[model samples]
Target: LMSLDTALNEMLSRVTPLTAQETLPLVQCFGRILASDVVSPLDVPGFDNSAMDGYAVRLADIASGQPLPVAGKSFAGQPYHGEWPAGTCIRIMTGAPVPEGCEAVVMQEQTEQMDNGVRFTAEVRSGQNIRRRGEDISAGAVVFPAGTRLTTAELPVIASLGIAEVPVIRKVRVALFSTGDALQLPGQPLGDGQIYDTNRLAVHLMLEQLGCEVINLGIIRDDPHALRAAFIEADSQADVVISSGGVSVGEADYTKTILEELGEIAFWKLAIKPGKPFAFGKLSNSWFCGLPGNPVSATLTFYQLVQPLLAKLSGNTASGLPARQRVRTASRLKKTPGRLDFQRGVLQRNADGELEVTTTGHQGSHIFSSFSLGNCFIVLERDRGNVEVGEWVEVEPFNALFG
Candidate 1:
């Protein structure tokens, strides 16, 4: 059995970023992986503009309790293009270009409106409240570097540079499936030995969250013919194929047999709690990830192992994997100390204002209810034993979809 980090390194060695790219409009570029660095063609402000709606004046012309004559008014689109007379100030709106020879802006409250000019009681400093050109973003600067995964907030930054289109990585297409003749769909009537297939939907949603184009192949039985056909189609069509169940060492489970016949397994069965019967291999042109049969086990292994692999395949190099934060435990956590434990837990701020985690009930692979009550996984090291009431534990927070 491989350690978690060891397995990840090996898995990553077998995968590479997809080289395909596509062009999308700025509006459609959000949530896509940027393929190249985006340089700012022009300065952010373009010209020196007003940072506030106030009087633009020179510092030398400003004096406490002294009046300065109004020269002109400057709006955003229409700037006071000509030079102002000495000792004269211009009324400026926010985002408007500063008048020629202006050095500062005094708020309206600081000045008194007189018959022909404004009298200031407060002292005005040089360059105060003035937004300098190219101050926010410099021209020809790399606004967003390559490998950037664009989010909602990043789109406006690109559009601000007057950019209409951008190059982004093409979405990864994943083929998903579930195995077991004893399993049935959610709406169907269950036989005596049948349980509804839950891992397929769980895997589908997880792949979707990573922005993969998921092709759900539904559920396949234990028959060799059905499995062979599904594998053939999945290998030819998708960049990756994922399935739950049938990879474990059971004579009736034929996933391993068919996979080994058609491809090769790098490794399987990691020393991780709730997930031991795992498999990673390649099926001709497509990568294969086989998750365990249990629902909790399937979900945990997908997040802990396959999520990072998918991220790299999608060209998201910066966001490698889910991160863990150090947190104190509120309750005693028991473990036998062999396989690393990923106990479902709820993180909350206690009365002491400290981050504390409390474990959910029954750390079993079959316990799906515990996950609903948990927002994180309290990961205990493989060599570590039971945890005391106040011990610090590293926790992996739930992803945005579950959060």
Candidate 2:
């Protein structure tokens, strides 16, 4: 078994980004990876404009300490065009284009509307509040670089530049399912010794959160013929195939055998608890991830290993990996040293406003309650042992999947 970092690097080295691209309307492009750089066709804000609802005047005029008469009004859509007279100011609303010769803006509250003219009650400086043309984004600028993931914050910038459509990488098609006849859907009746298939549901949703187009292949039973047919179909339709059970040395488990027959098993069994029996490979045109049968094990492996791998396959690296932080442990944590332990942890700020973590409960891989209670995984190194309270440890905080 290899260390987690070594395993991750190996996995990343084997996979390549998808080359497919698509054009979608700005409204439909959120969370999608930008396939190419976009040069701004026009300047953001397009022209010099007012940043406040006030008056625009020449700085020289304001500094002259002379009362100024109001000229034409300028709102956002309706802009004043003529040059301002020597002793005049324009009443401008926020976002209105600043007419030529205007050098500064004074807040409405800072000036008094006297019977004769407006008088400043506060000091006015040159270029105080004007949203200069091309200030936010210049025309012909690289608005967003390739590999950038479009987000809520980027949408308005694209729209402001009149970008009606965006070119983004095609969504990764992920074929996902669970295995073993002993597993049944949650809503169905369970046979003797059989349990509901929670891993499939969990993995399916996790894939969706990474911006994949999930092709639900349902559950495959233990039979070799059945599993083979399902695997072949999945390989044909998806960029990646993810299965949640039958990865270890089980008599009924034909996943490894069939996977090897169809393609290559890249690597498996990293030195990590709860997910030791994990496997990864490529099947013809698709990559495959075989997670262990236990619920928490399957979930943890997906987050630590499969999540990043899937992101590369989707050509969306923005999701990357869960962020880890050095935090003090609020409670004692117990463990052995052969494997890295990703103990479920409850994270919160203490009374002192410092990040502290406590184990959720029992650290067994099959325990679901503690996993449910967790907001992070207290990641102890493979060679590290029992941790006492107040000792520092790294925690991988849950991302959108757990949130």
Candidate 3:
């Protein structure tokens, strides 16, 4: 059985990222990956500005404790003009451009109101409370590098640079399908042993959340011919093709035999619980990922393996996996020593204000409700035994897919 790291590294090393690029308006560029670096066209602050609403004074003008007469008012968008008298100060609002020869801004709280003028109560230093031009971001600097994914957190930074359009990698086109004989769509009358085809819907929703252009092929039956045709069509139209079920070693699983004739694919028993039976390889025109039949296993395999593959294919440089942190377990966890366990867990702060995780109950691969009841995966080592309360375990919080 292949370890998760070894399997993932092999998959990443075998593929190349898509190079197609598109120019889009900033508003439409959210969730897209950048194809090139974004260079700033101008300084963040166009000119010297006041950081506070108060009196702008020359250091020498405030040396005397006496109240200085107001010369002129400088509000945001209205800068003081004309020569500033040697013994007077300017009333400036926050974000207002500091007048020429102004050396410092004394905040309103540090000045006393008087009949003559505002008297500085605190010692005023040169260049205090002033935001210098180009201090935050300078022109001609690389603001964001290529392969960066543009999101709400990043788009605003680009907008602040006056960038109207950006160059981004085109979205990855994914063809998705599920295969099974005992599967029935929701709202349909079920046969004696039929179950709702939940994997297709779950995978499709997750693909949409990851910003992929999803070509949902729906569900395929257990016929070899139908499976072969579906694979060919999916490979022809998408950059990556994903299918759930038919990868396991069941007798009705014809996906392996059909893919053998259609592409160079490999099936592996990964050293991960609930997601052991997995497949990956290249089809005629697209890459293929075959997930297990179980709903929980399919979602876990897709989240852990295919998510990163999609990210790499879409030219997204960010890691698709969430960072893991060690925390105490609030409940005992069940595990075997053969494979790494990813039990669904609820991570929360207890009365002591410390983070602890508890299982979502029933770590079985068939229990799909565990995903909804938990916010993170309680990752246990391959050779580790059952966990006791208060034992430290690594927990990885789910991303937007579960949120």
Candidate 4:
């Protein structure tokens, strides 16, 4: 039995950022991690582009109620072509390159259209609304260095530099399995002892959200030969192989035995609640994660440990979910402490808009309904016994924290 901290250290030690890289067009680069630095080939704006749609004017002629002659018009995609005459203003639109000799852009609403001229209604300050060259991204500067998690906000910056292609971190091919005698797939009739195997789909969705190549190996029956076949097939096709159930010592348990004969138990039976019978190890070249038989237990361990491991393997910078530094209460958590607990609960805001958590019905590993409704996890300390209400306990808010 390993402590949570020890287990984390072991997992972190074994895992490393993946080595592979690929080139994808900017369209496909979203959500992918950067394999290399995205250097600016040229200045982001390419030139001193206008930030406002207005009259580009010399600051000296911008006194209130003064009229300046319109020298030319400049819109997006087409510049003034030639320098503007001194003391004359040019009509400019947003994103249009600023005309030469222009020192400021007086917004259109502040300028009155007159016969072949525009009158300024307000005093325009020098360099107002003028986007200086290299203000956004200086040429030769690293626009986005390596190890960046490609997010939506980062796309516009790349687009601004006319980046059509980018080097992306390779996506790990992950294969998952769920094995049991009483397991049945959904949309099919369940037998007397069988239940729909939802554990696998839960993990599958989690993997998809992390942007991994998820391969479903289907459910393996409760036996040695069938389990071995599925395990071999999964390991052959994936960088990481994950399975739920059958890791503990049971009459139907063949997972641990197979691993002992064919692989190494990186570590098993963690000293943790709702997940004491957890398993993690390596089989040949692939990483192996053996989740508990219970649905709630499986989901808990998968999110806490397995998710970060995969992210590290995928070159993700923010690989681990940051611990939400929150203060909350027991909300009725009562039990003797033998292992660390991942109690399912709801996190809500109080009258002052502060974070508060409330535990659900039962904290049992088999409490699927209670766990399903819970968004936040009450991570009880290893030595923690019974907790009183309003105790300043640490709460791990749901990763859908903002959303």
- Ranking the candidates on lDDT from highest down gives 3, 1, 2, 4
Give model 2 RMSD, 1 decimal: 2.2
**Candidate 3 per-residue lDDT over residues 1-403, each given as its tens digit:** 7899998999999889999999999999888999999999999798899999998998877886678888898988888896778788999999999998888999999988888878898888889999999999999999999999998998999999988999999999999988777888899989898998888898899999889999998888888788888888999999999986654422334566777778888888899988798888888899999888778888999999999999898898888779999999989998899998889999999998999999999998757888889999999999999999989999999898998
Worst 10 residues of 4 by lDDT: 245-254
Expressed as tens digits, the lDDT of each residue in 1-403 for candidate 1 is 5788888889888898897999999887767889999999999789888888889988777853368788888997999876688777899999999887788898887888888678877878889888899999999899998788898788888999999889999999899988777889999999999999988888888788778898888988778899899989998889998876654433334566677788886546688888787778888999988887788888888888888888888787686666899989988898868888989899999998888999887887756888789988899999899999888899988877575
Tell me which of candidates 3 and 4 scores higher on lDDT.
Answer: 3
Candidate 2, which segments miss by more than 4 Å at Cα?
A: 59-65, 121-124, 247-254, 317-319
The global Cα lDDT (0 to 1) of model 3 is: 0.88
Provide the TM-score for each candidate, comma-separated: 0.94, 0.93, 0.95, 0.88
lDDT of prediction 1: 0.84
Worst 10 residues of 2 by lDDT: 246-255
Q: Which candidate, 1 or 4, would have the higher lDDT against the true structure?
A: 1
| Candidates in order: C-alpha RMSD to true structure | 2.0, 2.2, 1.8, 3.1
Task: Judge candidate 2 against the unseen true structure and give its global Cα lDDT, from 0 to 1.
Answer: 0.84
Question: How big is the positional error of residue 238 in model 2, measured in Å on the Cα after superposition?
Answer: 0.4
Tens-place lDDT per residue, model 4, 1-403, is: 6787787778878877887899888888777989888888787567787788898888766653357788788999889976566557899999898888777887888877888568888777888887888887888999887888887888777877888888888898899988777888898889898898887888888888878899997888778888888878888988898886655522234566677776876545677877766667778878888787778778878888788788788887774685766676738687567788887788888888887788877887655776557777788888889888888777777785223
Question: Which residue pairs of candidate 2 clash?
Answer: none
